Copies of this chain bind each other. A is one copy, B any other.
Amino acid sequence: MNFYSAYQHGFVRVAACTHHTTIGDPAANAASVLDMARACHDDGAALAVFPELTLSGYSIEDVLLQDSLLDAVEDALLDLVTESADLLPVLVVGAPLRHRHRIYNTAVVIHRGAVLGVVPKSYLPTYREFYERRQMAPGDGERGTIRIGGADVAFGTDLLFAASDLPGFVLHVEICEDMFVPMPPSAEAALAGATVLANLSGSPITIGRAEDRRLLARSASARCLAAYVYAAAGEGESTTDLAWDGQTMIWENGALLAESERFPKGVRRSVADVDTELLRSERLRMGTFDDNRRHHRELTESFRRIDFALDPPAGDIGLLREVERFPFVPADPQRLQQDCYEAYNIQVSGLEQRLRALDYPKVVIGVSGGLDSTHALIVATHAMDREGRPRSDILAFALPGFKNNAIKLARALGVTFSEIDIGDTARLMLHTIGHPDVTFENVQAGLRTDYLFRIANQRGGIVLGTGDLSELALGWSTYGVGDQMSHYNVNAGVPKTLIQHLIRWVISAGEFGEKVGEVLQSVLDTEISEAKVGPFALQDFSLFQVLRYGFRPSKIAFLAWHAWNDAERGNWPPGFPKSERPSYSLAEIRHWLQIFVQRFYSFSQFKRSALPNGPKVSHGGALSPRGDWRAPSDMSARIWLDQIDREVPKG
């Protein structure tokens, strides 16, 4: 295998281009197109979308009806088709074309020397600044073929272009207005199997229109679990009554992959690697999407599927994609602030309801001064405050076996604090079972929980769990009698990599006062097992890929390596001093991934199977056997380990 090849990992590189329009001069337009397409080829792109009516210019009005213009358009089209014999990408080029009685506003789908299909715009705006019905006919419901350079090629709104050697890539094409009506051709296309939706746009620019284009491309890409590739007209279009901004953009399932400078001087491209496996995975999981298709079975089975062989490049062509280091921790500070606000409120409101339902039990929690319990204590306190409960009904315990932050935190919040030395009970228990270990660690971990549960019976409380999602993922907890067990776990949904940011978020908001903030800060400074289970930054990364998308190990390694191999590349969330910004080699990423698949798929499930209650937090998922993760407690991880042996280089 070629492990560094984006194409071998299910990416398809796509381009949205804005060329230089020369109105009423198809030769000139074709030349600009040819030159941009050659760039896309050099970039290893599989697809290159151009603006509405590329070969004539969108804005020429009744000049679209002139024989000499239409004849010149055909001539130029045929030259492009001939040039395309040598170009890698599928070109989607706009052109006014004669068919039957009229000219249609069409997108010509071109590939390796042939026209694959010709797709007419369905809805022609004839209102405000738009007069398209005057010159051009609507495409909705046209089928059949059209004769282009002595060949009959598929013509109509119902076409799909499927790469025979790259099945994740199935192209559908619509045109500008098409995406703005209640029931866009692209939405039926997605249900029928289209994964990459192209839009050629003319779209003169006005205040607020760029937002409208975004709103609709973004929502389409999200609602149809698809990439949406959009190209609008720019410099060169007539400014008789309108101006043009050249916007290009590429969306993927609601996320912006790329966009280009608005009002550029010169031509611009958006180029991005679309993850066809992502779309595959989203669709495999959201059964209601298939249900929608079956309900519109007639609409969706009637698409004609045109095949082509892409034969993309096999080598290292980089990865034109922003892979964030912390799938659970957004690098953008505004976005991170928002996530924290949500995570915190989820945790709190999860706990408020349990407490309301139990008519306000005391809250029993083991506080050790570490990140997890510190944060849980804070969550508990807020929940109690919001429910008008005295903080003294929170019972915090230090349980020393064989830290100062804990008592300082508890005194500062003003909950009830208490120490119980479990050492003697442990000594008694170790002696009673005849121990001279994991047994040694576990006797203490167990007795901590045993004590808390009993205190909870005694004092009318519930025991608050504090184990985080990353520990659930790797089975890094003592199961049953031990920290795995509790009456309600507020941390169950929060991965370890997010925890430290919640604590800062709490400090930064300042709600608990200056003294509490200082202790919390101390906890952070002090606290920041990764020796045996690996760095949580890496295991949280793999967890997200597995839990959300079920990606194979080699795909996960590829992604993590692009995100993590170079500390200077990409973005870091706030709060990583340059001394704690590590980079990881492939060898490391591989290593921790072996530990991960073995622990996640095989070892740890029985511990998640009997999990106490607690709220889902991340869109990446949570690990409740009653919600996001239903799996066997008795399965081997052989095939994932084997996939790593076979597909991931040793370094």
Contact (Cβ within 8 A) B140 A295: yes
17 contacts between A and B (CB under 8 A): A61-B631, A65-B550, A67-B549, A102-B284, A134-B630, A141-B297, A183-B187, A207-B339, A215-B222, A216-B223, A238-B634, A241-B615, A243-B349, A243-B353, A420-B432, A479-B487, A480-B485
Asked if A453 CB lies within 8 Å of chain B CBs, one says yes
| A241, A347, A546: residue with the most chain B Cβ atoms closer than 10 Å | A241
Which residue of the partner chain, among B69, B292, B446, contacts A450 with CB atoms under 8 Å? B446
Asked if A475 CB lies within 8 Å of chain B CBs, one says no
Asked if A204 CB lies within 8 Å of chain B CBs, one says yes
Which residue of the partner chain, among B102, B237, B632, contacts A60 with CB atoms under 8 Å? B632
Contact (Cβ within 8 A) A123 B291: yes
A612-630: contact bitstring with B at CB < 8 Å (1 yes, 0 no)?
1111111101101111111
Contact (Cβ within 8 A) B630 A626: yes
Asked if A449 CB lies within 8 Å of chain B CBs, one says yes
Contact (Cβ within 8 A) B346 A206: yes
Asked if A5 CB lies within 8 Å of chain B CBs, one says no
Asked if A468 CB lies within 8 Å of chain B CBs, one says no
Contact (Cβ within 8 A) B480 A451: no
Query: Chain B residues with Cβ under 8 A from A180's Cβ?
Result: 223, 288
A122-133: contact bitstring with B at CB < 8 Å (1 yes, 0 no)?
111111110101
Q: In chain A, residues 589-632, which have Cβ atoms closer than 8 Å to a Cβ of chain B?
A: 601, 606, 609-619, 621-622, 624-632
Q: In chain A, residues 171-206, which have Cβ atoms closer than 8 Å to a Cβ of chain B?
A: 177, 180-183, 187-188, 190-191, 193, 204-206
A131-B481 contact, Cβ under 8 Å, with A123-B292, A349-B243, A435-B458: no
A249-275: contact bitstring with B at CB < 8 Å (1 yes, 0 no)?
000001000000011010000000000
CB distance from A237 to the nearest CB of B (A): 7
Query: Chain B residues with Cβ under 8 A from A349's Cβ?
Result: 235, 239, 243-245, 263
| A134, A287, A351: residue with the most chain B Cβ atoms closer than 10 Å | A287
Which residue of the partner chain, among B209, B239, B293, B636, contacts A354 with CB atoms under 8 Å? B239
A627-B210 contact, Cβ under 8 Å, with A183-B191, A357-B634, A640-B68: no
What are the nearest 3 A-B pairs in CB distance?
A: A219-B219, A357-B634, A238-B632
Query: Chain B residues with Cβ under 8 A from A428's Cβ?
Result: 424-425, 428
Query: Chain B residues with Cβ under 8 A from A458's Cβ?
Result: 433, 435, 437, 439
Asked if A72 CB lies within 8 Å of chain B CBs, one says yes
Query: Chain B residues with Cβ under 8 A from A348's Cβ?
Result: 263
- Tell which of A18-26, A79-87, A315-323, A565-573 binds the partner: A18-26
- Tell which of A46-54, A516-524, A526-534, A551-559 binds the partner: A551-559
Contact (Cβ within 8 A) B485 A485: yes
Asked if A442 CB lies within 8 Å of chain B CBs, one says yes
Contact (Cβ within 8 A) B122 A619: no
Contact (Cβ within 8 A) B288 A634: no
- Nearest chain B residue, comparing its CB with the CB of A283: B101
Query: Chain B residues with Cβ under 8 A from A61's Cβ?
Result: 630-632
CB distance from A252 to the nearest CB of B (A): 14
- Nearest chain B residue, comparing its CB with the CB of A263: B345
CB distance from A17 to the nearest CB of B (A): 19
Contact (Cβ within 8 A) B69 A639: yes
Q: So how many copies of this chain end up in the complex? A: 3
Which residue of the partner chain, among B22, B98, B137, B424, contacts A290 with CB atoms under 8 Å? B137
A243-B207 contact, Cβ under 8 Å, with A69-B639, A238-B353, A453-B480: no
Asked if A583 CB lies within 8 Å of chain B CBs, one says no
| A288, A442, A451: residue with the most chain B Cβ atoms closer than 10 Å | A288
CB distance from A597 to the nearest CB of B (A): 9
Instruction: List 9 extra interface pairs beyond A180-B223, A215-B254, A480-B485, CB under 8 A.
Output: A23-B632, A68-B552, A127-B287, A181-B292, A182-B293, A218-B219, A425-B428, A429-B450, A446-B450
A34-68: contact bitstring with B at CB < 8 Å (1 yes, 0 no)?
00000000000000000000000001111101111
Asked if A242 CB lies within 8 Å of chain B CBs, one says yes
Query: Chain B residues with Cβ under 8 A from A301's Cβ?
Result: 144
Contact (Cβ within 8 A) B127 A23: no
Asked if A578 CB lies within 8 Å of chain B CBs, one says no
- Per the bound structure, the CA–CA distance linking A288 and B239 in Å amounts to 25
Contact (Cβ within 8 A) A285 B613: no
Contact (Cβ within 8 A) A288 B123: yes
- Nearest chain B residue, comparing its CB with the CB of A340: B207
Contact (Cβ within 8 A) B633 A613: yes
Which residue of the partner chain, among B127, B353, B437, B480, contacts A486 with CB atoms under 8 Å? B480
| A182, A238, A617: residue with the most chain B Cβ atoms closer than 10 Å | A182
Query: Chain B residues with Cβ under 8 A from A144's Cβ?
Result: 301
Asked if A289 CB lies within 8 Å of chain B CBs, one says yes
A215-B219 contact, Cβ under 8 Å, with A239-B634, A353-B238, A425-B429: yes
| A208, A297, A486: residue with the most chain B Cβ atoms closer than 10 Å | A208
CB distance from A511 to the nearest CB of B (A): 14
CB distance from A225 to the nearest CB of B (A): 8
Query: Chain B residues with Cβ under 8 A from A342's Cβ?
Result: 205-208, 210
Asked if A286 CB lies within 8 Å of chain B CBs, one says yes
Query: Chain B residues with Cβ under 8 A from A295's Cβ?
Result: 122, 140-141, 183
Asked if A415 CB lies within 8 Å of chain B CBs, one says no
Contact (Cβ within 8 A) B612 A609: yes
A125-B287 contact, Cβ under 8 Å, with A67-B551, A551-B67: yes
- Nearest chain B residue, comparing its CB with the CB of A125: B288
Query: Chain B residues with Cβ under 8 A from A98's Cβ?
Result: 284
Contact (Cβ within 8 A) B346 A487: no
